Every structure is written in structure tokens, then in C-alpha cells.
Design a protein around this ligand. Structure first.
Ligand SMILES: *[C@@H]1O[C@H](CO[C@@H]2O[C@@H](C)[C@@H](O)[C@@H](O)[C@@H]2O)[C@@H](O[C@@H]2O[C@H](CO)[C@@H](O)[C@H](O)[C@H]2NC(C)=O)[C@H](O)[C@H]1NC(C)=O
Ligand SMILES: CC1=C(C(=O)OCCO)[C@@H](c2ccc(C#N)cc2)NC(=O)N1c1cccc(C(F)(F)F)c1
Ligand SMILES: *[C@@H]1O[C@H](CO)[C@@H](O)[C@H](O)[C@H]1NC(C)=O
Length: 218
């Protein structure tokens, strides 16, 4: 997240860090005790048996007792098309079930097909790059953003910060976009580099996939 701020510790207990031996590479959202959802592009060309699913985290630089770590048992995809940038969503079934507590909670999703109007106010978040050569965040970051339909496709939810350069960035992929308390987006792609101040950020539209999500987690 470029131009954001530190989240209050465990403000967003559905927030997940996906990690390899090397550490954080993508976000995800806890959608049931034994399922997280993320961007398909996070796991294309990754060894999924090596992925650690880290719940309950805040400061990735410290050891945190609040954390629960799982492995990935199964992957569900839904037509990921990297060439057209479509269907950038994947569900990862965990090798166990999370212990739901103050720090680890499942997110609420929208109704199937629910679109967001121009001007809806959301929060983006992630442990991604803070900006040019500032590296990934240690502490979870959040950012006020605004839904825009201009310079966006119908197959995405797009957001833009007006009046300054701020937005999601590498490492934020797969992270939730929270709008009116519901997970309406999964961070998918940027244009013109991160925080261009020109192109809106693009998210997979969670509302378009709710029936499919339910078929799997329910
Ligand atoms: C900056 O964003 C915060 C948080 O956004 C809200 O909560 C998110 C989880 C998500 O649901 C968004 O869609 C929401 O808009 C805003 O904080 C809220 O502000 C209102 C009005 O001042 C306040 O009454 C609420 O209690 C706040 N909600 C929460 C959850 O803290 C804030 O307004 C945004 N600021 C700007 C200028 O856009
Ligand atoms: C991170 C990545 C790509 C990437 O790994 O592709 C490699 C795939 O092999 C590539 C991309 C290609 C296809 C899709 C789709 N469907 C999505 C993204 N384009 C891209 O913009 N990012 C990127 C950069 C900064 C922030 C974010 C965000 F998710 F928004 F947080 C994403
Ligand atoms: C799930 O994977 C984690 C991380 O490797 C491991 O600690 C734990 O034993 C596993 N839980 C199971 C198999 O129930």
C-alpha cells in the first residue's frame, strides 16, 4: 500500500498473509474457518504445497502468538484468464480449521451480483510495497479509496484516490477491498505502476462470484 497508514492491530481479523519460505508474497481473506480467498495470479506458478496461510497477523517482522498458520489442502479456481485479466480469484482450502477469536474472524461477503456505485467509499489494505524501493510493509497498512467506474471494466471493481498518489502495490495482490463492511474486491492489478494518480486500481469483483464461493464453502 502506497500512501496509506498503519492499521490498528487486528482491526481486520479476516486479513490473511500468504507466505513462502521467503515470507509474505500476497494477501487473502478468511471466508470460513477452513477457506481463504485470494487472487488467482498470486498462486499461478507457485508451489501451493509450500504456501503458509498466516491468520491473526499484524506485524510480520515480529513473532506473534496471535497467529495461526495453515497449509493449503485444495485449490478451487473459476476461469482465471491472465491474458484478458479476468476471474482473478481462487479459493484455498486449509489443512484444518481456524480458531475464531478476537484476532481471527471470517469476513462477510456481499449478495450475488451486487454492483458498487461510483463514489462508494472503501478501505484497501495489505502488507505490499510502501512505494519505490521502500520494500514491503512490516505492519498491515490500510488506505481510504473511492470506487470509480471510469477507466474501469465492468468485469472489475476499480478504486482511485483523488488529489494525491496512493494505491495498492506489489504484495497487496489478493488482499480484500472492504466496502460498507463487506468484502467487495480482491486486489488484482495496477496500471501505470503503483499509485500513478492516473489509473484506478482494479479488483476482482467478489459480488460476481458469490454463488460459486457459496457452492464451495457452504
Ligand atoms: C476512511 O475510511 C474509514 C473506514 O471506512 C469505512 O469502514 C470500512 C471498513 C469500509 O466499510 C468502508 O466502506 C467504510 O466507509 C471511514 O471511517 C468511517 O467514517 C464514518 C463517517 O465519518 C464513521 O461514522 C464510521 O464510524 C467510520 N467507519 C469505520 C468502520 O471506522 C472514513 O470516513 C473514511 N474517510 C474518508 C474521508 O473517506
Ligand atoms: C502482481 C501483478 C501481476 C502478476 O503477478 O502477474 C503475473 C502472472 O503470471 C500482473 C497481473 C497479471 C494478470 C492478472 C490477472 N488476472 C493480475 C495481475 N499485473 C499486476 O498489475 N500486478 C500487480 C502489481 C501491483 C499490485 C497489484 C494488486 F493486485 F493490485 F495489488 C497487482
Ligand atoms: C496444517 O499445516 C501446518 C503448517 O505446516 C501444520 O503446522 C499443521 O500440523 C497442519 N495441521 C493439520 C495437518 O491438521
Amino acid at each position: 500500500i502506497v500512501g496509506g497508514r498503519r492499521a490498528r492491530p487486528h482491526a481486520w481479523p479476516f486479513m490473511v498473509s500468504l507466505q513462502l519460505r521467503g515470507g509474505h508474497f500476497c494477501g487473502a481473506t478468511l471466508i470460513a474457518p477452513n477457506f481463504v480467498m485470494s487472487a488467482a495470479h498470486c498462486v499461478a506458478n507457485v508451489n501451493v504445497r509450500a504456501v503458509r496461510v498466516v491468520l491473526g497477523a499484524h506485524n510480520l517482522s515480529r513473532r506473534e502468538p496471535t497467529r495461526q498458520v495453515f497449509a493449503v489442502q485444495r485449490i478451487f479456481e473459476n476461469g482465471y484468464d491472465p491474458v484478458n485479466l479476468l476471474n482473478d480469484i481462487v479459493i484455498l482450502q486449509l489443512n484444518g480449521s481456524a480458531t475464531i477469536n478476537a484476532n481471527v474472524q471470517v469476513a462477510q461477503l456481499p449478495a450475488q451480483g451486487r454492483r458498487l456505485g461510483n463514489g462508494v467509499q472503501c478501505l484497501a489494505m495489505g502488507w505490499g510495497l510502501l512505494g519505490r524501493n521502500r520494500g514491503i510493509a512490516s505492519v498491515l497498512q490500510e488506505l481510504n479509496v473511492t470506487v470509480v467506474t471510469s477507466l474501469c471494466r465492468r468485469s472489475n471493481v476499480c478504486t482511485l484516490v483523488r488529489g494525491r498518489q496512493a494505491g495498492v502495490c506489489f504484495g497487496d495482490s489478493g488482499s480484500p477491498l472492504v466496502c460498507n463492511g463487506l468484502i467487495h474486491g480482491i486486489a488484482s492489478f495496477v496500471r501505470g505502476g503503483c499509485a500513478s494518480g492516473l489509473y484506478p486500481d482494479a479488483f476482482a469483483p467478489v459480488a460476481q462470484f458469490v454463488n460459486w464461493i457459496d457452492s464451495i464453502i457452504q
